Design a protein around this ligand. Structure first.
Ligand SMILES: CC(=O)N[C@H]1[C@H]([C@H](O)[C@H](O)CO)O[C@@](OC[C@H]2O[C@@H](O)[C@H](O)[C@@H](O)[C@H]2O)(C(=O)O)C[C@@H]1O
Ligand SMILES: CC(=O)N[C@H]1[C@H]([C@H](O)[C@H](O)CO)O[C@@](OC[C@H]2O[C@@H](O)[C@H](O)[C@@H](O)[C@H]2O)(C(=O)O)C[C@@H]1O
Ligand SMILES: CC(=O)N[C@H]1[C@H]([C@H](O)[C@H](O)CO)O[C@@](OC[C@H]2O[C@@H](O)[C@H](O)[C@@H](O)[C@H]2O)(C(=O)O)C[C@@H]1O
Ligand SMILES: *[C@@H]1O[C@H](CO)[C@@H](O)[C@H](O)[C@H]1NC(C)=O
Ligand SMILES: *[C@@H]1O[C@H](CO)[C@@H](O)[C@H](O)[C@H]1NC(C)=O
Ligand SMILES: *[C@@H]1O[C@H](CO)[C@@H](O)[C@H](O)[C@H]1NC(C)=O
Ligand SMILES: *[C@@H]1O[C@H](CO)[C@@H](O)[C@H](O)[C@H]1NC(C)=O
Ligand SMILES: *[C@@H]1O[C@H](CO)[C@@H](O)[C@H](O)[C@H]1NC(C)=O
Ligand SMILES: *[C@@H]1O[C@H](CO)[C@@H](O)[C@H](O)[C@H]1NC(C)=O
Ligand SMILES: *[C@@H]1O[C@H](CO)[C@@H](O)[C@H](O)[C@H]1NC(C)=O
Ligand SMILES: *[C@@H]1O[C@H](CO)[C@@H](O)[C@H](O)[C@H]1NC(C)=O
Ligand SMILES: *[C@@H]1O[C@H](CO)[C@@H](O)[C@H](O)[C@H]1NC(C)=O
Lengths: 168, 314, 314, 168, 314, 168
């Protein structure tokens, strides 16, 4: 676990319905809550990949070994049931473990994709900003809906904005 | 600038390695509970035996007259089915069923046996056709007259085919020693059977059994698989139901037992008594004895798989 | 300001995906090795058979006189137990035991058979009570005099109960043909047995066997389960041990085999020959054949589960 | 793995017996080695959760299929043993894998909870301090047992202390 | 300063929890496909039975004359092997093989039986040595003259050893009732067999079988394991092949069936019909019925394990 | 996953054949692409540890239960095959899951060892440098093949170089 989702970030945005991970800035010109695609998509293609691994096709046929209209001899009958029940315990165990393990990883995986989004927005706004501590970045040079777009789509100049913010 | 993640009002609890009931944004079921209460048989050569018992297809009681040479990918046994007109049963009956279930059906072939100096048309009111009849593939061999005697005969049949020949005969057990003689004459009667593979022998055992189909006698059915070019030999002297025809396996099939009806509108590969399991899920909680190509049976009703992040509302 | 984590002097080595013997702060065992060398039976209706063999509860040798109608949740078989006074054995004996083990005990019921024109009180010094006796639930049927003959009889019993009726009879094999006649008169003797379900038949086989319990003859015990409203029929003429009473299953139980003593002070659900496994652990290395509700047997003596971080000392 | 426990942090504190993760500062007024609760507790509730998942109750009864006072027929006997041994291999494997997998995760989990403690103390003392590189923070404005408490219980003002340290 | 990781031109696709075919720098196979087409037997006491059938080692047809007392860690059965000179077969034959396979070989011991008032040297052209012979460990017991009669005898053998004594006898089934009398005199012939453990009995069953090895009669072979200090008793009167010697298990071995040759230059522990699987891998896709100490059989041909990071080229 | 290999770092170096993780600087005196040993080795000893866990020795013998020269009776034959096939499904599943799980972890493991290398070079060059954002560090005090070695082998003074770079 990476410490973002249910981490220092207190909660989620039940109005963000455009993707899994997004942006929301608080400047002068009103507002804007957005969506990041390449973080949303990458986490989606991985959950989708897990799911498509659990759907498969045994070309493995099994036949009747028992008879429910006409019970087989008791001794062989009991061996068969004993065998079937043993096998049932095995699969019930495998299933329970598989899902628990997979869910644990899925959860740690989505948390990962938050932290990987963040930590590279952080590296985009080099010294022209600071980490608030709730997933927020205080920009010390009043960015706008042209700047804010340049961050969202990774084009923000990590220098041609600097010293205006540096001495503040 | 700040960034967060999405969330929802009502989420789905799942279980993890560390927790039980942690809410995630979305989940999906992993265990199949949905049954279709019909035998999905779309595209498959199917045979519903109804009242004909599977073993009856070999011996030929009237229920099985239209099944003496069936051909199938899928064989359906029914509870109302009977292998028998005249009361009796097969030795190692279940092994035979499993053979017949994966046989693809049967082809019949005359074994050629000719008889001289005995009767041949033994029948009963337990096997009704016109009036009294018998198993269609079998021969109720008898002493010539209403007593008389039975010449210890020998019949032999050679499998001249490239496949094993299913041979089946019967031992008749009469109500009494009185009846056994009135049919086959007196004395301890003996049937011996051997192939370059097989080795057995039989004496009848007369006595009064309770009435089944209005009859107190029984017929013991036995069988063996004759390999190609191997020969089988029947040394007998009475109490004997002769094989008239042999049976050959056609190829491959799957056999099931069910109480629900056929549907050529749905395709299935996983069957059980109450219908068809059509699913992509790796597991099922419907029937542990389901056959064909099935998800693995598990005891759990439900196991939810996370398809999203942890759901955290404000 | 600086921050670190705790550690300890002596830690616990565990195994990982990547390493063997990596020390962690704390660990806990996952495989049960602790046995309690008693049959923990607290709160359970228990029956310790001691010297009575489980199959003896049906036929009734003197060891089993106090067990002819037992009722239990838990049945304990003992090494010193015997199914037999007069030497002999059961056909398909183990299937029967497994049935009796999960039966909840047995209820007995008279089958009503009345006899005329033969003897009925056949006994032996192998079955001591007052003096010479026999199996309490069985009838040693005999020719009237110290030779005489045996009229080929027929007895029939109908299960008028809502449950299967366990029927048991015996075939007596005498030391000789001399003895067989002195008991049942001369001639090949035959017992036939049939139900609307079942189909079999028997001839004795006299000859000298070695002495067991001072006896060189044997009794062959056979059995069948009669379904409700189905009838069973016994056609015989000698060499025959008649069932006097039938048996019905009471409900549900579990049966074990053990050499250790009962303890009503401890509750257990997982049993084996050397006692009771009381544990919450998912696995055990005590006995692979343990029965009841048990952790899964594994070959490993120990598998330690990390309950703390890696232990790093200075 | 996150790189803290047995990471850049050289070792552990065999005197920290109040919790799993704690604090130890080095200012003028003597010393003070403490304990963090919400990092200690969260890692504990997760190990506790694993453990409580491995303790369960098969209401799955198995019966005798064998007989040790009276050996069953050899052919069926051998099939039974062969079956039992196959099943034994399966469970021995499942057990060994389960534990190894679980331990690997438990270890990476405790390491995680160190890094999540650290990296948010770091975000508390915004630019008023620096990362030494051994899990230590050089505060450039002489904090005390009132300050040090304010960090330990997340109340340190990440500004009302700033420029005193900024020009140092 | 900048830092990166290594990569390669051509990498290896592997599968993950989330993907199929993600390239990594290096991989290694986990499933064994490599077979060695020989029986690697280096350092092991090995016995290749060739034409001697495993069960023949007990009875002693001429193929097995050099195997009557073999000693082995590894026993190899061959397709060309036969248990039989005079045509016949064993009852519960496969159970016996499994016993003989893990026996470590056999030691023979005279049972001491002496005969008076019958013939003893019965032979046949199916068992060639000098000229006509018989199974070397068995005794073809006969009526004194070319008819005559057979005194109902009794022979008994006590296991005075600390191990179970494998006892084997035969029942002879003649071509006819004519032949059965010309050999053993007239009348229903009976063999009874019992130990303080065991309980059975036999009547022959004459009749014409097809010709095997130029012979139309059959010999039925039966067997039992006599516990120490327990005694076995043979009550008979004809149609009987007497055990001349008993057999004891030497210790421990493993038995296989193969069509490939022995190689004392390679050591193996995992065997199958087509050779030896020598591997450290946890899995194999070679033969699901491989025996000994083997990797687990899986259906997959290949499962590649990552031994490096993801491979990312520019 | 940690976000380095196939993360913000665009690709790998198909000329780095001295180890798994290395260094490459771009100063005046030509060039120099190197290799880090203790990151390369630690990731190697862990892959090596996984591999050595999958190679083991069942002292678990199995015997013939079947006969291919002489077929056993059909009923017991079918039970045996049914049992064998069930067991085969189990192992085929275990194998497929084991490998997929192990590979997922191996990959996330090597990524981890990149991030643990980086993030401690970053903590070595305290404020005397900045994160470019492609795994590169802009040193603001022209380091050389004596400096560059001091970083590679963790000896760089995280102060005795400072203010020369601080005011730049
Ligand atoms: C070949 C032959 O004998 N067929 C008979 C048949 C047999 O004798 C009998 O099945 C052998 O056990 O008997 C048939 O009628 C039998 C008759 O017996 C009465 O006692 C009873 O009351 C009737 O219900 C009925 O079973 C038969 O149909 O089988 C006549 C047949 O010709
Ligand atoms: C009903 C009856 O005949 N009971 C007999 C009994 C049977 O005849 C016998 O068990 C059938 O095989 O024999 C009894 O004594 C047998 C007696 O035989 C001697 O040869 C032997 O030396 C003694 O040890 C003893 O076995 C018996 O008790 O079974 C008498 C009984 O009346
Ligand atoms: C002890 C004895 O009688 N040995 C005979 C043997 C037996 O009688 C026979 O095996 C029992 O079934 O017969 C032998 O020759 C039999 C002979 O029979 C002819 O009909 C046939 O054409 C021949 O091929 C051959 O089988 C034998 O060798 O077994 C003679 C031996 O003395
Ligand atoms: C085997 O199990 C089934 C249920 O799956 C049960 O109905 C049946 O009675 C059992 N067979 C025998 C022989 O007891
Ligand atoms: C819920 O999960 C399933 C499986 O991925 C999917 O069918 C469905 O689209 C999901 N719901 C949403 C919000 O997409
Ligand atoms: C099978 O039949 C062929 C064709 O007649 C015959 O030539 C051959 O002998 C037989 N095969 C065997 C097993 O001998
Ligand atoms: C050691 O582990 C077990 C399992 O959690 C526990 O009973 C015990 O309390 C642990 N020891 C410590 C230090 O708590
Ligand atoms: C069972 O007994 C009832 C009660 O006498 C009877 O009416 C009925 O015929 C029987 N059931 C069957 C199977 O016919
Ligand atoms: C089955 O295994 C047990 C040990 O678990 C052994 O004692 C017994 O001999 C085996 N059974 C047979 C029939 O060999
Ligand atoms: C490829 O993987 C295997 C397993 O570790 C190993 O034998 C081989 O050395 C590897 N190749 C390289 C580049 O080392
Ligand atoms: C076995 O043999 C010994 C030695 O003669 C004998 O004393 C003893 O009675 C026998 N054991 C048994 C089972 O009685
Ligand atoms: C069991 O499976 C094998 C293949 O593994 C097959 O050849 C054989 O026919 C099967 N046995 C029976 C009795 O059908």
């Amino acid at each position: 676990l990476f410490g973002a989702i249910a981490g220092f970030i207190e909660n989620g945005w039940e109005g963000l319905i455009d993707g899994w991970y997004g942006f929301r800035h608080q400047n002068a010109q009103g507002e804007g809550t957005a969506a990041d695609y390449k973080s949303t998509q990458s986490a989606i293609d991985q959950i989708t990949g897990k799911l498509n691994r659990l759907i498969e096709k045994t070309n493995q046929q099994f036949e009747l070994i028992d008879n429910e209209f006409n019970e087989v001899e008791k001794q062989i009958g009991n061996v068969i049931n004993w065998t079937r029940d043993s096998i049932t315990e095995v699969w019930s165990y495998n299933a329970e473990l598989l899902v628990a393990m997979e869910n644990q990883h899925t959860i740690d995986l989505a948390d990962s994709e938050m932290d990987k989004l963040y930590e590279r927005v952080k590296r985009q706004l080099r010294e022209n900003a600071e980490e608030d501590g709730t997933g927020c970045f205080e920009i010390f040079h009043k960015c706008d809906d042209d700047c804010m777009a340049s961050i969202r789509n990774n084009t923000y100049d990590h220098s041609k904005y600097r010293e205006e913010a540096m001495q503040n | 600038i700040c960034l967060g993640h999405h969330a929802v009002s009502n989420g789905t609890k799942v279980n993890t390695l560390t927790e039980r009931g942690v809410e995630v944004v979305n989940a999906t079921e992993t265990v199949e509970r949905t049954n279709i209460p019909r035998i999905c048989s779309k595209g498959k050569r199917t045979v519903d035996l109804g009242q004909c018992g599977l073993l009856g297809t070999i011996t030929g009681p009237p229920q099985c007259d239209q099944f003496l040479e069936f051909s199938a990918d899928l064989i359906i046994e029914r509870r109302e089915g009977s292998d028998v007109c005249y009361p009796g049963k097969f030795v190692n009956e279940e092994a035979l069923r499993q053979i017949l279930r994966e046989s693809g059906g049967i082809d019949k072939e005359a074994m050629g046996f000719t008889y001289s100096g005995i009767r041949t048309n033994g029948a009963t009111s337990a096997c009704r056709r016109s009036g009294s009849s018998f198993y269609a593939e079998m021969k109720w061999l008898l002493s010539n007259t209403d007593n008389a005697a039975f010449p210890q005969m020998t019949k032999s049949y050679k499998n001249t085919r490239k496949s094993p020949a299913l041979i089946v005969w019967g031992i008749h057990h009469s109500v009494s020693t009185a009846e056994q003689t009135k049919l086959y004459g007196s004395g301890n009667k003996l049937v011996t059977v051997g192939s370059s593979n097989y080795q057995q022998s039989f004496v009848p055992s007369p006595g009064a059994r309770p009435q089944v189909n209005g009859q107190s006698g029984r017929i013991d059915f036995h069988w063996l698989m004759l390999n190609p070019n191997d020969t089988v030999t029947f040394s007998f002297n009475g109490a004997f139901i002769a094989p008239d025809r042999a049976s050959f396996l056609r190829g491959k099939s799957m056999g099931i037992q069910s109480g629900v009806q056929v549907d050529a509108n749905c395709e299935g590969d996983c069957y059980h008594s109450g219908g068809t399991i059509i699913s992509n899920l790796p597991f099922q909680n419907i029937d542990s004895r389901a056959v064909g190509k099935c998800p693995r049976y598990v005891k759990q009703r439900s196991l939810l798989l996370a398809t999203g992040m942890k759901n955290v509302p404000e």
